[PDB]
Design a protein around this ligand. Structure first.
Ligand code: ADP
Ligand code: ADP
Ligand code: ADP
Ligand code: ZN
Lengths: 146, 49, 72, 439, 443, 152, 426, 152, 66
């Protein structure tokens, strides 16, 4: 049960070949949950509330809060540790860099944005004619017809 | 489609409150004595140890 | 300016191009010392905990510090 | 000789309901004997569930203690199959300190309606010959490489982009390895090191098992079948990158809006033909324990179009409902009681108790004499069937202690004298009135 | 010396080859039928066939039901798990009762798995990036491998390593004089610190020095570890890693028990089945002993109902000492032993009877000898009579204070006067209750 | 520090250069966006979505894992009108524990356990004022509905 | 017609508590009528509230159900008006899950007493004409009102403050000098050729504006709790404010009042349905009403001699005698025929329904026989029926029809006794 | 590199010079205090509060984001005798849990919501010992107060 | 090799007329400098439990958060 992957459990796998149509069967193996499942999105999004005072000291303080209180804490909460941030900065010249330990390590399938661009494959599932044509095409391709 | 985005007017704190309202600001001279009298000071730690 | 790393069948290989900083270096064993330093007072056989400040000799404890202070 | 995690339990002999193609129960088949009417009704409801067209149907099984209600439940669970979701929940498995009773019941309901997805991907299984990495000196962090794969028939050379190289480095893949490459997602699954390539080796930097080389063509297609319950889809979509809550069970009182969103999305998924939704069965056992609020939530939750075919079980009589002071049949208010069919079970006889004992001994691999069988049946008629079932293992152990092979009446009498029954224990209990606590 | 407990003398049931109970063996006297039944139960547990079978030891207080469970545990050995429990452990403010019970049920099932450890460790001396002498087109050289010299208290040897390990060596501070270790299966490198040999070249160094390793440079051994099935649950529920904001956040927050979902168990069972089928791990079922069961709840009993007929549950031994009592969680539903009848039909009842004065005196003598106490016969008989007057516990408890009084008086053994003085000083339950009844107006 | 981000976006019509706030640069670096990757930025919230590399870079690598999307059609910068159905409780819950924005507080609040909380009267009143202001602008239309309480 | 968030409610027809200057109530004014002996006694309490001299006073309104004890307390809020805090909560809303019951009452007291201050600010408001920023940086811009123009040289900070918020020609902007915030209001009509259209401002560009601000005492307490304490003041995440902080804040406010650096505005706490409030809360109230900073509270009870919650004891109004001595009791009286008819007239005016004169007598009879609320809700149903009938004025025959559709408690209960078998648990 | 920093204070009653350890210099640098600002300093606590630029520089720019204040009309050096009271419970609460050490410019106080907890007895004993030691040194004295309970 | 600053000497308590955020004045150590000896520690078993309860459990000893 890794903390960075979506593992459903164990399920048998079938690997079909291309020659002689031989299908091999595998035993229990770790299975990753399909990505598409995540489709939910909140109805409304809000910017976090912020305060406002009427002097330069409070303005400076809230401008600090707008980009994090300190650089040390910012790289801590973004890479895992300041030394981890330095490692990520200089990893470019390393053949085998150590894995990152911050928010950049976490990579959700849809990202942190809730905007959802209409998938192209919807073209098939919105028209039956297209649906037909698709399956007939797969068929004819298999057979070899022009 | 994207979620409807809202943004509220910032909460307003007056300058009188920002200057004389934080207990953390008008009691720094009293929190200093609590940090002096804390038993976690290295002097007391070494002495007791 | 390309550093090549080949995990071949016969064995691994890491190549370095001309004028590359060639960070790969070497190491050696610095020569050790036979006897450890001892307390400057001939009678005391303890090792050197520290060196004195006023006169600058190896010392071990309060007694040898007082001895060195008196004998100077 | 080897002992797996699954042992011989109390219902380990029941392999089904034992019904013919005409749905007529047999006297003795598939580990089930007697109780013809209840088995018939169970077969009817099993065929009904298999058809899977109507929703929110409830069935209650009532009868005497130790008359096979749980046995019927396990039988229909085994007959249903492994690929059809079945959930067994006790009566007290919903009173939780982490979520409300209604929330627990909602999770139990949504845990029964499964979604089956067939996932077909294109993969490349092959042995690694050599790997080429060309690190940049300064530049801007762009890496380039090549990778040669070989099988017993064909071999090829592949180019590498800037995405799989980091994965290959993270997995630390070197020469002499057999790997499966997922073309779609891009993950690298490690099988093991080969044989011939192991001849040229440095000091031990990787010591593990050994494998062979994938024969045939280098590129193939793999297929997986995923069965995902609605509840875990809800948990997945309730928070970003939240997946340990499937195992940790930390999600509590999920927001409804997520639930309707998942319901709608599952509806479209069914319409598009990609995934297939299959209703399951929920089995709540000893359901007299449910508070009245749970029953009344069941009332409304059973009228939805996604509810499962819940099956009840109760052995109580005219008893007050938990949390109230009103009497009612089966300890259940009439409102819920008026929305389901009730199946009753009859007490057993000698002829079928003997066959129950015989099949239990066949399961446990114990041999007794016919006189021993008669004595055991007399015990299992003067005393409950569970006691007679339990005595079998003790008698077999006692017989094996004296280096015997066939259990005899003397062994059974010895075991009867050694252990005790509830009735005999209570009888011996009355003579120590002052010796016990709080009489 | 190990301090004397209240059940130290119990070393076994003391049975023959034919299973008959000896009159006095392994610190147990009497209760012959109970000992025979417990031996049968021990054989059942060792059979590795049944699952979810339960036995209820029923008897008056202070008749040995708790002792017999420990005797069964001792006769079982130490390679099979034996999980004790009281009836009050279910009531938790962090998690529901049926999960406390499920976790405990999963505790009493243990694994045992074997593996090999291979490591190259020792003091580093030199690092020679041995090159192949003939660079390739477009390059000035071609490093072939790295020669690393490692020395321990046995000897020095040189190992040829993959060049990429050098990239890891500069990741840490790998200089001559340090002691390192590389895992053969993993292949990583880790630095422990500078040797003690160079601990005197300075007067104040910020690093702490470790002793030079003793033994061969390349170590390889075989180890067998035992883990219960509950440990896998907790390990898989809370992934202990550091390269995450979630792992570290949870590791900073207050740790709380979480209700483990049944899907996690469904996959752990599959993987352990696969590894058992591959012959790597050996499963050993154990025993779970619940004492004072009468403190459970009707919800707990109703969950135990379903819990027992499982094909995975271990063997459970219940113990109780209540008469016809009201079941906890109900209003006035009385039942024997405070246990519901429907549950009580799934258990095998073992009756435990009282103790005759001869057996009580034998128990007193056994306790005195195990405790390291010498007693005279004229005082041992008086102590046995006093115990028979009130109870066995009150007789056994007065052993130590009498010995202290005698040692204060200088005598090396207890006499009549010491026992009578100790009995005059302390009181029993019956006399105290009589005093309370007499003086009820002033309490 | 960073004050400006210069981004060149090439659609089917052509290419244009834009100057954007450093928060947009932070989001772009967050999503691992390089040259040749189709992106879609909204200026109301600053959110950035990456769809993968362009279809032109299809034959560059024999083996690859990234998905390829075709070149977008239309103008680089464009505004669109979206009709949305919402409830008062959606606005209230979104303003209770905010999750919008590209900062670190809301990003890490997106990962914590979603616990409910007791909303005070002040937030409800302020939401009422805001929705009244929206109504007065001729955009917000109110459609009160029905709540069905069963087994009351 | 656009629909406001606020619509026609149960008390939406009340706008202020009508009384004359001598505190004597007239028969009909400001939408509410009746209760001659109750409106006069409410005027004294309203005057005490609007004074603020004395602290910690409790008044309880007791009477028959439906006799306006909630109506007069709702009109008191309207007559008090804004700028004086008024917190109204239900008696069952203090039983929180993440907050103690004693702490909820304290959190409710401190929402009603406020602290008011006045300060000065420098504001630069006007229409911008031209902006020029070179390549530190040098900036220059010319502001223009309807009565003057002025050029300005910008410092380095103002360069960023103007580049962050893109300001072009013909924009009416307002700037806070002490902070640097640019708050544009719109564009002028002059530059509209070739999105709120505002005209150019008037007067001097730089104004010294006096701004008054009030903050709740509970608001002050919550700000000091966390690093950003104001955030928890909207989401309710605050819980169990430490009792030592409150004492220090009280001392601070007391010395502010003594030095005249700020003023204290007493407020009103309305607590509805007190009859269900544990004896612990009552005992806490007995001591929380003797504080110097104790607001004035109005409480309403519609129950008689009843067992008080949490115990097995019986006391009038469902309140122990100890709390009854602290407060003053005002008793309402049941409405008469004329009062009921006038109430129906006022309601029909509120929902704007034109109905016949002959219907008032039958509606008044129905209200007098059915607790006066059923008649109130019958009006909308009758109007809907008439609208379905394509008529314009509500007639008697269109009321009795509704009288046959929707039942009341007495008729439904009577129809319940003859279906006893089919109804559960009776 | 740095040992101490010399600062010069001036009002319309005189001028003084002060010597600051690097901690106070760091505190001044955090407040973004440059030469020509009105500063308030407390020697006992080490508090640093910037009260705005002096009015004499108000003409330096026509529009500046800063706010200007007049030169103070008072003594640069002020001495007072102050008597402080603090109950034991304050010490217990302060030392029971890690003191936030956050007074703005930190988002890590935005993670854990403070909650009242059960004070152990080991802490209370340590506090008692420390208080005994300090009142034996003569720095502080002790006063036994009164507790009052209603609705007992 | 860990430094544990205890404060400043009494004789060094005048070169700064504005002390920093947190400073303490303690007397100079007396006696021999580098002391080597044996100490006895009496620790309750509850402390050993709490320390291993979580990753950093010694805070719970005073906080009571265990
Ligand atoms: N018809 C049957 N066929 C086979 N076994 C049965 C049958 N009825 C009861 N049994 C056996 O009786 C035992 C106890 O039954 P149980 O499940 O406790 O009944 P209930 O749940 O109704 O009390 C079970 O282990 C089961 O194997
Ligand atoms: N068969 C026995 N042999 C020796 N000692 C016994 C035996 N049975 C009981 N005892 C003694 O009695 C004491 C209390 O018995 P215990 O097991 O607590 O009874 P219960 O479980 O009924 O409370 C124990 O200290 C034990 O040494
Ligand atoms: N004096 C009054 N003037 C106008 N309407 C009233 C008056 N008294 C009661 N009502 C009506 O009664 C309804 C609510 O009664 P309410 O005041 O809640 O009863 P109670 O006083 O028993 O709480 C309101 O819709 C209101 O129109
Ligand atoms: Zn010496």
């Amino acid at each position: 049960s890794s903390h960075c992957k979506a593992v459903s459990g164990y399920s048998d796998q079938v690997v079909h070949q291309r020659r002689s149509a031989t299908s091999s069967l595998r035993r229990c193996l770790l299975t990753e949950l399909p990505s598409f499942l995540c489709v939910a999105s909140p109805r409304v999004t809000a910017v976090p509330l912020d305060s406002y005072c009427n002097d330069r000291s409070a303005e400076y303080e809230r401008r600090v809060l707008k980009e994090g209180g300190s650089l040390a804490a910012k790289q801590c909460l973004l890479n895992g540790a300041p030394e981890l941030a330095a490692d990520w900065l200089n990893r470019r010249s390393q053949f085998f860099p150590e894995p990152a330990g911050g928010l950049w390590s976490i990579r959700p399938q849809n990202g942190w944005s809730f905007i959802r661009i209409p998938g192209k494959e919807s073209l098939i599932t919105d028209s039956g004619k297209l649906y037909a044509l698709d399956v007939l095409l797969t068929r004819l391709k298999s057979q070899g017809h022009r | 489609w994207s979620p409807f985005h809202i943004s509220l007017k910032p909460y307003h704190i007056s300058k009188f409150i920002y200057r004389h309202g934080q207990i953390r600001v008008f009691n720094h001279s009293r929190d200093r004595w609590l940090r002096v009298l804390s038993p976690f000071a290295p002097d007391y730690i070494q002495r007791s140890l | 300016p390309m550093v090549r790393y080949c995990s071949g069948a016969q064995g691994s290989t890491l190549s370095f191009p001309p004028g590359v900083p060639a960070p790969t270096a070497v190491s050696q064993r610095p020569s050790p010392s036979g006897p450890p330093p001892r307390c400057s007072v001939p009678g005391c056989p303890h090792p050197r905990r520290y060196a004195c400040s006023r006169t600058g000799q190896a010392l071990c404890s309060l007694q040898c510090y007082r001895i060195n202070l008196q004998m100077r | 000789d080897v002992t797996r995690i699954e042992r011989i339990g109390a219902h380990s002999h029941i392999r089904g309901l034992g019904l013919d193609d005409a749905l007529e129960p047999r006297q003795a088949s598939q580990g089930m004997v007697g109780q013809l009417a209840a088995r018939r009704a169970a077969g009817v409801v099993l065929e009904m569930i298999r058809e899977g067209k109507i929703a929110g149907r409830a069935v209650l099984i009532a009868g005497q203690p130790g008359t096979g209600k749980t046995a019927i439940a396990m039988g229909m669970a085994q007959a249903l199959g492994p690929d059809t979701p079945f959930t067994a929940i006790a009566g007290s498995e919903i009173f939780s300190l982490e979520m409300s009773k209604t929330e627990a019941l909602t999770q139990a309901f949504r845990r029964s309606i499964g979604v089956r997805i067939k996932e077909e991907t294109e993969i490349i299984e092959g042995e690694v010959v050599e790997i080429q990495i060309d690190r940049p000196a300064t530049g801007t962090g762009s890496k380039v490489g090549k990778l040669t794969l070989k099988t017993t028939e064909m071999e090829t050379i592949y180019d590498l982009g800037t995405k799989m190289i980091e994965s290959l480095t993270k997995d630390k893949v070197q020469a002499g390895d057999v790997i499966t490459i997922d073309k779609a997602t891009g993950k690298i699954s490690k099988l093991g090191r080969s044989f011939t390539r192991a001849r040229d080796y440095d000091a031990m930097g990787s010591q593990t098992k050994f494998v062979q080389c994938p024969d045939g063509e280098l590129q193939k297609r793999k297929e997986v079948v995923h069965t995902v319950s609605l509840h875990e889809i809800d948990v997945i979509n309730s928070r970003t990158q939240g997946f340990l809550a499937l195992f940790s069970g930390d999600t509590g009182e999920i927001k409804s809006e997520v639930r309707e969103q998942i319901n709608a999305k599952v509806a479209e998924w069914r319409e598009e033909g990609k995934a297939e939704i299959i209703p399951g069965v929920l089995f709540i056992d000893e359901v007299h324990m449910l508070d009245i609020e749970s029953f009344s939530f069941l009332n409304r939750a059973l009228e939805s179009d996604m509810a499962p075919v819940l099956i009840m079980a109760t052995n109580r009589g005219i008893t007050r409902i938990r949390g109230t002071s009103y009497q009612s049949p089966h300890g259940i208010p009439i409102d819920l009681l008026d929305r389901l069919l009730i199946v009753s079970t009859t007490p057993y006889s000698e002829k079928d108790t003997k066959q129950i004992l015989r099949i239990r001994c066949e399961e446990e691999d114990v041999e007794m004499s016919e006189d021993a069988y008669t004595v055991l049946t007399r015990i299992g008629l003067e005393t409950s069937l569970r006691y007679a079932i339990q005595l079998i293992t003790a008698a077999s152990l006692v017989c094996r202690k004296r280096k015997g092979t066939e259990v005899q009446v003397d062994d059974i009498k010895r075991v009867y004298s050694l252990f005790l029954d509830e009735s005999r224990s209570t009888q011996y209990m009355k003579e120590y009135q002052d010796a016990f606590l709080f009489n | 010396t190990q301090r004397i407990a209240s059940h130290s003398h119990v070393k076994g049931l003391g049975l023959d080859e034919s299973g008959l109970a000896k009159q006095a063996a392994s610190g147990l006297v009497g209760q012959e039928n109970a000992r025979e039944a417990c031996g049968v139960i021990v054989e059942l547990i060792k059979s590795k066939k049944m699952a979810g079978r339960a036995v209820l030891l029923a008897g008056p207080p202070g008749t040995g039901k708790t002792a017999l469970a420990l005797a069964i545990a001792q006769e079982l050995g130490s390679k099979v798990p034996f999980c004790p429990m009281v009836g009050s452990e279910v009531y938790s403010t962090e998690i529901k009762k049926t999960e406390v019970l499920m976790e405990n049920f999963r505790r009493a099932i243990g694994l045992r798995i074997k593996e090999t450890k291979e490591v190259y460790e020792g003091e580093v001396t030199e690092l020679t990036p041995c090159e192949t002498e003939n660079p390739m087109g477009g390059y000035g050289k071609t490093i072939s491998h790295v020669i690393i010299g490692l020395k321990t208290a046995k000897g020095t040897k040189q190992l040829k390593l993959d060049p990429s390990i050098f990239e890891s060596l500069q990741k840490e501070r790998v200089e001559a004089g340090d002691v390192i270790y590389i895992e053969a299966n993993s292949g990583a490198v880790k630095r422990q610190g500078r040797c003690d040999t160079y601990a005197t070249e300075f007067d104040l160094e910020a690093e702490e020095y470790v002793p030079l390793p003793k033994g061969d440079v390349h170590k390889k051994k075989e180890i067998i570890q035992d883990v219960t099935l509950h440990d896998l649950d907790v390990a898989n529920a809370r992934p202990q890693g550091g390269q995450d904001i979630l792992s570290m956040m949870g590791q900073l927050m207050k740790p709380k028990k979480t209700e483990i979902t049944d899907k996690l168990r469904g996959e752990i069972n599959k993987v352990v089945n696969k590894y058992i089928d591959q012959g790597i791990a050996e499963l050993v079922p154990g025993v779970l002993f619940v004492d004072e069961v009468h403190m459970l709840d009707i919800e707990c009993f109703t969950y135990l109902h379903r819990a027992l007929e499982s094909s995975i549950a271990p063997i459970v031994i219940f113990a109780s000492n209540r008469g016809n009592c009201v079941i906890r969680g109900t209003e006035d539903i009385t039942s024997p032993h405070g246990i519901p009848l429907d549950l009580l039909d799934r258990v095998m009842i073992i009756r435990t009877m009282l103790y005759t004065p001869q057996e009580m005196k034998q128990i007193i003598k056994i306790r005195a000898q195990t405790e390291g106490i010498n007693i005279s016969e004229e005082a041992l008989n008086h102590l046995g009579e006093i115990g028979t007057k009130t109870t066995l516990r009150y007789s056994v408890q007065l052993l130590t204070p009498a010995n202290l009084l005698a040692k204060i008086n200088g005598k090396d053994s207890i006499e009549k006067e010491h026992v009578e003085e100790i009995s005059e000083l302390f009181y029993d339950a019956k006399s105290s209750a009589k005093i309370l009844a007499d003086q009820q107006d002033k309490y």
